[PDB]
Design a protein around this ligand. Sequence first.
Ligand SMILES: Nc1nc2c(ncn2[C@@H]2O[C@H](COP(=O)(O)OP(=O)(O)O)[C@@H](O)[C@H]2O)c(=O)[nH]1
Ligand SMILES: Nc1nc2c(ncn2[C@@H]2O[C@H](COP(=O)(O)O)[C@@H](O)[C@H]2O)c(=O)[nH]1
Ligand SMILES: [Mg+2]
Ligand SMILES: [Mg+2]
Ligand SMILES: [Mg+2]
Ligand SMILES: [Mg+2]
Ligand SMILES: [Mg+2]
Length: 403
Amino acid sequence: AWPKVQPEVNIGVVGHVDHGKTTLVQAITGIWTSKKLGYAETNIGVCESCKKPEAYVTEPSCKSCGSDDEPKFLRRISFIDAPGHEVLMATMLSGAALMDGAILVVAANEPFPQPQTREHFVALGIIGVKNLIIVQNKVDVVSKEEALSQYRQIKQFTKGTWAENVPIIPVSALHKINIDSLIEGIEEYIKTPYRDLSQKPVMLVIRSFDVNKPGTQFNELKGGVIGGSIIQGLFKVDQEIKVLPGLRVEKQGKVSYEPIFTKISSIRFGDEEFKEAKPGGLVAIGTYLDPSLTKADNLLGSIITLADAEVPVLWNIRIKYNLLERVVGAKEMLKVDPIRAKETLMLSVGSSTTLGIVTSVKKDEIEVELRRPVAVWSNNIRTVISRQIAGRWRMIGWGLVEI
Ligand SMILES: Nc1nc2c(ncn2[C@@H]2O[C@H](COP(=O)(O)OP(=O)(O)O)[C@@H](O)[C@H]2O)c(=O)[nH]1
Ligand SMILES: Nc1nc2c(ncn2[C@@H]2O[C@H](COP(=O)(O)O)[C@@H](O)[C@H]2O)c(=O)[nH]1
Ligand SMILES: [Mg+2]
Ligand SMILES: [Mg+2]
Ligand SMILES: [Mg+2]
Ligand SMILES: [Mg+2]
Ligand SMILES: [Mg+2]
């Protein structure tokens, strides 16, 4: 049979709203994710007797190509499908911190390139998720020649760009057409990255919940669960951990943050239990925390490390920054203005997003006073910078958080 193992790689699914991201994930995994960020897993195998791409399978069966032989197991993979709506760009940025590679979904029956087609694309480039496949979705609704016409636009768009040789794979997610070619492309272009498991364990938090059913007996109350993805190193059951920045405290008009210390009581990927958690997949860390602390994604944006790790938790940061020429996600083309002092910016760092006031601007560096602190677990940490333009937070640049 096939091993029951954790997913070993995270594939983002991004692109403009309604282009078919969620349907594409369902086409691949059989799972419909109504949750955003959405999440789903599948095993991937190959029938070694049969010809490709239909040799690739997402279940342990080669019936569809003749064999009663079991297909060779290749790996378990995970999809993170980001929301496409322009107002949800911050959520796309959080999710991108979790991605090892991405699929950019482009609807074949809409004029390319749409605003979030562009914004998601450049966001991926900035944060370095460059193992990209471009998927031309909804080909079922246009003629071959119309699809090809857009194909050459996509090629024109990526030319002269880091994505110049990114593959473009046409499919119908809704009617499940040419999905085998996408799976073959996933194996070819989105390899599982090398993981240095000696690095200090860091997990980025995107969810937290109280898993207790209603009216549950108080002696019966399970501890809080925290969901996210392990970004480096690995965690084990019964490891002493902390959540950073942690818990916000009133005290009584002056707000501060206190690290939350706890212990890993259980580890879970999907519905399977494990003893360890490594990079790849969305992990649910069980803890001894009061469920009231982890209710309703309360800890989104936090990180988790071992209890004794040294981690700066900063209310002021220095960023070595670069601005985009123009505001890519806007409908109307707009040039980005230089950072000005005393202007509030939105910073995405890991899975967190937080507002700050610019206290210093230089050609290559800004300093900002944060409304809430961020945990900075490493020296070269990419941040994405957004400005409120048009009543809406728009990506305008990026930087390195300098410590
Ligand atoms: N005709 C056709 N419709 C599709 C395809 N994929 C998605 N859709 C439809 O497009 C709409 C938006 O799909 P959805 O996956 O929710 O888009 P998302 O916002 O990017 O996640 C839904 O009505 C889908 O049924 C496709 O391959 N062909
Ligand atoms: N590690 C761990 N995860 C749990 C436990 N109970 C629920 N989860 C996880 O928490 C999430 C929400 O579960 P639900 O509240 O829908 O039952 C799921 O990802 C599930 O796997 C648990 O006892 N230990
Ligand atoms: Mg969706
Ligand atoms: Mg499957
Ligand atoms: Mg197949
Ligand atoms: Mg990555
Ligand atoms: Mg067609």
